[PDB]
């Protein structure tokens, strides 16, 4: 007897309430619900209307600047699950600056399959620090509760008692409360999400959130898997086909949809893999009659023609339209603003594209760790470049460290150049490897790739200093290395030893007390060369140390600056530019003296 | 009876000693003395020869890698003054890595008119910390005693006693000693440099260093001013003419020199202003007969044709060849390596050039504070540019703050662009003023002038925050300002107040404890707007404070980032990028929401 209602399309509700209660006869919404700006409503016409028949929303629910909305307790009293088929800027439940919302009161909300929550800028909102956000969301890293009244004043929340279980999330039982008259059902964890009928009884796997009987896929409010004829079922049995991730429809439904969109005006709703997919995927075509996407001879690739040849990617909502196509007829300006590692969603959506007929621009995308998103990118053309005729733009991606893995990834950049200036944690070795593998057709000129202000956050001196002698007895640590000399021995200022008191085995690169040691004597003979080393003062018995040494050298513009760094080994137990300027002055005068004194035969 | 000898040209002495004692008959040297590399000499053939007739050297004295030179006590026992007409890399006395030099022993050396000393890399040199360097050099800022034996071991110097006056240079009498058998004559300071004959007796102004009699310009070893017929005299009386800054010659001498160089092969030695100048200056020409540079009709400018159209300037020796000419037929790559402000010499030599038919490149010239050197530069052509077609290159001039004063300086850069990337202490306002005044003919493209990594060392927010209310009684400091709002009020993170305990009235820009204050409320009405201010905690009575406030805002690429900074006023008495990223994320989501919700008529 589940879902006693029709199936509602996505809705925009602006201005007044008549459409909001056009939502009376609605047990499920196939689109998005947007209760948008309403100004002439006051907290007295929000009491009579109520919609207890709404069970789930397929895409998301957005509420933005509606006055008089005291609570959602009566508006959505039976909202069980909000799926994440289509998001709104990688958020499945957005609550913006709308005011007069004293409490959330979604006591029947139990899970959100995909997405996050961005309740923010609510000036009069309480009962927010006790909401679960642990049993409703399984991906809690983008939750963005910031600017509500709970962070400005003290509300002094109460909660129904005698008596509703608090749970430990930081180390103490506080509350898991929804409102002044309701709490949220938490049930034994032996079942992840199968339904619990007010006692300890996990229902069948084919039930999501809530159930009313013992194991009975046909008796529960929502289906985790596909829904068919009043029963929650696995992959649709024949002759039923999948539809929009939650229904099992019959062939006639897709026929009617195709006939309606083929002439009236549309997401043709073709059948590929027992799913009534809007469009045939890459490598398949629609012929006639039976709705099937047969494989095409002379491989046919799916293209995503851009609006005007340019696209900015900032969330998963914008990246979801670039799904299923392998050729991009435009350019990508991916720009991930924020402090979250949006990698899985971009890989799933923006991963099948192989040809970009434009420029791959990377703007100020913070928290972007790698470019493995385009794991099938083999060709970046250059038909439509940018100003300066660059084909690969790369602004200050602060957390960018490693580009495409050049051991198993191809590339054929054609008719364009590169642009790598201000990426802090990147290193020039990766850029040069990209140059060698891709074979750039533009041969970028000077200062296109910044030589020095492009790797000064991670040590990639691309050389190793093997330790030779270690002897630690009670208080002295003795070090001996293999001496290293750059092509010009006068550029080596010395070695900068690092050591830190740490008995723990997970130590990374740069607390970290620094010492300076003078370079050895250039004996120019196969002698000991003094094996620079150092003898640190200060030690207590039975401790572990972490040490790694970096070489300090002068900068050379017309060369990749040399360097060396030993691996971080562990001992078991027992005025920075003035010196560079002075060394450069010494070198300059010595070179001038040699040039003046030493001249060839007149 | 002064100068009982001939006049020696400049000399190079390599290999062996026969030319060194070709210097027997020599009371003055008109050029440079270079005792260069000698290898087959040992410390036993340096005893018999001595040159007590050498009184002064006109240009400089260079000693480089000669072995067995135990001391200069016998080699140059009468060297009184070394002038600075022509230097060797802005040094008038160079002593390089030559070894076996136990002591300097130039006890008769008393003054160096122009230049410095660079005694360095002497592995066995003592008696160096007691040399005057206060009465010999009047320009002690480039002296470069660094790598001698006195800084590696302890020599334990002795000094002739009973008895030779030490003088205070750091706060204590130590020594002013020359060697184990000689000290240096210091005499009363009532006369700067006029000669003192072993007692308190300042000789005539026309005597330099040493004199033997009472005031008698005709009786002293050296002349401060010009020398004429055995007497030290002022500007040469007629019919005598100046010659090489130290002689008074007669007309026949310049006739003979001109006749010798006009046919045999040469610094034509023409007469302009009673000086036998090698070449006529700008605006004058040589006609015939009488050696005179009459003014030329149809103004004739003097040009300095470069060797191959390119020149690197690194000291005063290289800049001295560009003296007296107004048009440069090449390019300048001025590159001042070091920590000294070489400004007066460059202004005197490299100051009359008006047209540079090339590119003005500025390489890694540290300690360069301004570009007022070319005070007569009105035209930088573009006939011969560099790679990238730049006409004004500017690399990381760390101490560059202020370019040509654009209130009284012209410029006509033609056929070229600009290049301002990594000048730390420079500011974008000066570059844009240069653009407005010069009127660049190239219209440089994007990223030619770095927008952001070009002013992050000096506060030039080009705005003022006038203080409104100040009230300090015993412990509280209250501040009220006029509120400042950028074009987008969401970019203002707040104000960063600075205060430092300082009862002294000379306080400059950025110890300096930092506090953060939240921005006020955007009332959008002519209200108080909360007048942000702050109330610092901690104060003791009867002290002075220095305070100045800077505004923290997000960076905007397609705009000169706004800002404000109050003037440094004095009170009389009584995780930095994560926040920026979060603010940018807030702005990005709000903009996306406004764009999606607000659409025009379909």
């Amino acid at each position: 007897h589940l879902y006693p209602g029709e199936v509602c399309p996505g809705m925009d509700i602006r201005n007044n309430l008549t459409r909001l209660h056009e939502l009376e006869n609605c047990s499920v919404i196939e689109g998005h619900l947007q209760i948008l700006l309403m100004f002439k409503t006051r907290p007295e016409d929000f009491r009579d209307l109520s919609f207890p028949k709404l069970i789930m929303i397929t895409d998301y629910l957005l509420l933005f600047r509606v006055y008089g909305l005291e609570s959602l307790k009566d508006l959505f009293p039976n909202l069980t699950v909000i799926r994440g088929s289509r998001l709104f800027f990688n958020y499945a439940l957005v609550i913006f600056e709308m005011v007069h919302l004293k409490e959330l009161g979604l006591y029947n909300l139990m899970n959100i399959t995909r997405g996050s929550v961005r309740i923010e800028k609510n000036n009069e909102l309480c009962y927010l620090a006790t909401i679960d956000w642990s049993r409703i969301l399984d991906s809690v890293e983008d939750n963005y509760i910031v600017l509500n009244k709970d962070d400005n004043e003290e509300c002094g929340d109460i909660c129904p008692g005698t008596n509703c279980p608090a749970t430990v999330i930081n180390g103490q039982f506080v509350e898991r409360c929804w409102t002044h008259s309701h709490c949220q059902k938490v049930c034994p964890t032996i079942c992840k999400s199968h339904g619990c009928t007010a006692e300890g009884l996990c229902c069948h796997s084919e039930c999501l959130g809530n159930c009313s009987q013992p194991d009975d896929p046909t008796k529960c409010v929502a289906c985790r898997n596909f829904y068919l004829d009043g029963r929650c079922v696995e992959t649709c049995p024949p002759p039923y086909y999948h539809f929009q991730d939650w229904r099992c429809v019959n062939f006639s439904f897709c026929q009617d949809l195709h006939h309606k969109c083929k002439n009236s005006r549309c997401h043709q709703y073709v059948i590929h893999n027992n799913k009534c997919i809007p469009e045939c995927p890459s490598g398949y075509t629609m012929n006639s009659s039976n709705l099937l996407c047969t494989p095409c001879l002379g491989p046919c690739p799916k293209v995503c023609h851009l609006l005007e040849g340019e696209k900015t990617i900032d969330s998963v909502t914008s990246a979801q339209e670039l799904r299923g196509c392998t050729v991009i007829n435009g350019s990508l300006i991916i720009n991930i603003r924020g402090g979250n590692n949006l990698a899985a969603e971009l890989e799933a959506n923006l991963g099948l594209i192989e040809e970009i007929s434009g420029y791959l621009k990377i703007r100020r995308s913070y928290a972007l760790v790698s470019l493995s998103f385009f794991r099938k990118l083999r060709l970046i053309r250059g038909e439509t470049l940018e100003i300066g005729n660059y084909s690969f733009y790369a602004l200050d991606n602060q957390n960018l460290r490693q580009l495409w893995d050049w051991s198993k990834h191809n590339l054929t950049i054609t008719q364009g150049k590169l642009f790598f200036h201000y990426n802090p944690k990147l290193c020039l070795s990766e850029i040069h490897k990209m140059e060698e593998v891709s074979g750039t057709k533009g041969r970028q000129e000077r200062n296109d790739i910044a030589l020095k202000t492009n790797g000064d956050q991670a040590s990639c001196e691309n050389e190793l200093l093997k330790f030779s002698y270690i002897r630690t007895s009670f208080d002295k640590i003795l070090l001996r290395w293999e001496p290293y000399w750059p092509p010009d021995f006068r550029d080596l200022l010395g070695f900068m030893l690092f050591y830190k008191e740490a008995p723990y085995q997970n130590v990374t690169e740069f607390s970290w007390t620094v010492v300076d040691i003078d370079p050895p004597l250039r004996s120019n003979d196969p002698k000991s060369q003094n094996h620079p080393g150092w003898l640190m003062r200060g030690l207590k018995p039975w401790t572990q140390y972490a040490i790694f040494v970096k070489t300090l050298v002068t900068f050379s513009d017309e060369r990749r600056t040399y360097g060396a760094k030993s691996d971080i080994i562990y001992v078991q137990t027992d005025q920075i530019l003035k010196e560079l300027e002075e060394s450069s002055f010494r070198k300059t005068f010595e070179d001038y003296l040699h040039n003046v004194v030493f001249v060839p035969r007149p | 009876h002064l100068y009982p000898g001939e006049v020696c040209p400049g000399m190079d002495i390599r290999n062996n000693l026969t030319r060194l004692h070709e210097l027997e008959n020599c009371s003055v040297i008109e050029g440079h003395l270079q005792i260069l590399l000698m290898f087959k000499t040992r410390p036993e053939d340096f005893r018999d020869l001595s040159f007590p007739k050498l009184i002064m050297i006109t240009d400089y004295l260079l000693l480089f890698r000669v072995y067995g030179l135990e001391s200069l006590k016998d080699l140059f026992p009468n060297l009184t003054v070394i002038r600075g007409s022509r230097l060797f890399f802005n040094y008038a006395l160079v002593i390089f890595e030559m070894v076996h030099l136990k002591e300097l022993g130039l006890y008769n050396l008393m003054n160096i008119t122009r230049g410095s000393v660079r005694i360095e890399k002497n592995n066995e040199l003592c008696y160096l910390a007691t040399i005057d360097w206060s009465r010999i050099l009047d320009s002690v800022e480039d002296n470069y005693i660094v790598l001698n034996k006195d800084d590696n071991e302890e020599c334990g110097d002795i000094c002739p006693g009973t008895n030779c006056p030490a003088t205070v240079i750091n706060g204590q009498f130590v020594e002013r000693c020359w060697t184990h058998s000689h000290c240096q004559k210091v005499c009363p300071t009532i006369c700067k440099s006029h000669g003192c004959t072993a007692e308190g007796l300042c000789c005539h102004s026309e005597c330099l260093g040493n004199c033997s009699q009472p005031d008698d310009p005709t009786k002293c070893v050296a002349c401060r001013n010009f020398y004429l017929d055995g007497r030290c005299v002022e500007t040469c009386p007629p019919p005598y003419y100046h010659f090489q800054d130290w002689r008074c010659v007669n007309f026949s001498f310049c006739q003979d020199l001109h006749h010798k160089c006009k046919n045999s092969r040469c610094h034509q030695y023409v007469i302009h202003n009673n000086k036998c100048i090698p070449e006529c200056p700008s605006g004058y020409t040589m006609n015939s007969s009488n050696l005179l540079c009459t003014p030329c009709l149809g103004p004739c400018p003097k040009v300095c044709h470069l060797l191959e159209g390119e020149k690197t300037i690194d000291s005063v020796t290289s800049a001295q060849e560009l003296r007296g000419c107004t048009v440069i037929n090449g390019s300048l790559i001025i590159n001042i390596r070091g920590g000294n402000n070489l400004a007066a010499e460059l202004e005197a030599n490299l100051g009359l050039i008006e047209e540079i038919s090339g590119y003005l490149k500025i390489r890694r010239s540290y300690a360069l504070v301004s570009l007022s050197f070319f005070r007569k530069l009105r035209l930088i052509r573009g006939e011969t540019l560099e790679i990238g077609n730049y006409s004004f290159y500017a690399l990381d001039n760390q101490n560059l703050r202020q370019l040509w004063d654009w209130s009284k300086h012209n410029l006509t850069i033609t056929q070229g662009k600009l290049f301002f990337h990594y000048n730390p202490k420079l500011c974008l306002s000066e570059i844009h003023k240069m653009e407005e005044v010069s009127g660049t003919k190239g219209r440089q493209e994007r990223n030619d002038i770095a927008l952001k990594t070009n002013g992050d060392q000096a506060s030039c927010e080009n705005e003022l925050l006038k203080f409104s209310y100040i009230r300090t009684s015993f412990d509280k400091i209250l501040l009220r300002w006029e509120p400042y709002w950028p074009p987008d009020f969401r970019d203002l993170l707040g104000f960063m107040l600075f205060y430092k305990e300082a009862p002294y009235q000379n306080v400059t820009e950025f110890s300096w404890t930092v506090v953060d204050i939240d921005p006020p409320l955007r009332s959008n009405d002519p209200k108080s707007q909360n007048h942000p201010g702050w109330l610092m905690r901690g104060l003791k009575p009867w002290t002075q404070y220095a305070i100045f406030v800077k505004t923290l805002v997000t960076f905007s690429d397609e705009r000169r980032t706004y800002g404000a900074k109050s003037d440094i006023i004095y009170v009389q008495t009584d995780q930095i990028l994560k926040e920026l990223e979060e603010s940018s994320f807030r702005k990005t989501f709000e903009d996306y929401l406004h764009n999606v919700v607000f659409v025009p008529r379909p």
Partner: peptide
């Protein structure tokens, strides 16, 4: 430019024999 020729690049025996004038 001997520093130019024997430090940034590689200079052979003949070029050093050429620069021998500076010591002789």
């Amino acid at each position: 430019g001997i520093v130019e020729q024997c430090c940034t690049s590689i200079c052979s025996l003949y070029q050093l024999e050429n620069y021998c004038h500076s010591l002789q």
